[PDB]
Design a protein around this ligand. Structure first.
Ligand SMILES: CC(=O)NC1CCN(Cc2ccccc2)CC1
Ligand code: NA
Length: 121
């Protein structure tokens, strides 16, 4: 239908907007601590600790299959990345601190992205 096509045009342009947002987000992770899923080879008990793993590679796969229907969903996964890290790793570690910095630098990007999503509808 025309209705379905228009629906998919918005989804596509959402996806274009999210791909940008996701790049700005990785750019704030120069150490690439969150680029890839935590290796179960190197940390074999990880899933005993973290129930829902997330990372940028995984988010990017979902994104390219247009699996993000709105910004709430995308933010949910981004927060998973941060919250998992600040749980699994202790306060005085390089990993925890990298997450706190991503959280803070990221929040700016998501503050404006939320406005662009509303207005562009
Ligand atoms: C995003 C995130 O939580 N990263 C974690 C992955 C595990 N490393 C520690 C590590 C490295 C190598 C071997 C055994 C443990 C850093 C913390
Ligand atoms: Na902890």
């Amino acid at each position: 239908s025309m209705e379905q096509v228009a629906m998919e045009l918005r989804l596509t342009e959402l996806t274009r907007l999210l791909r940008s947002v996701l790049d700005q987000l990785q750019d704030k992770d120069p150490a690439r601590i969150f680029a890839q899923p935590v290796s179960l080879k190197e940390v074999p008990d990880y899933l005993d600790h973290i129930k829902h793993p997330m990372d940028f590679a995984t988010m990017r796969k979902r994104l390219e299959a247009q699996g993000y229907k709105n910004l709430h969903e995308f933010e949910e996964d981004f927060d998973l990345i941060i919250d998992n890290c600040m749980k699994y790793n202790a306060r005085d570690t390089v990993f925890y601190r990298a997450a706190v910095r991503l959280r803070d630098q990221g929040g700016v990007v998501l503050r404006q992205a939320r406005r662009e999503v509303d207005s562009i509808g």
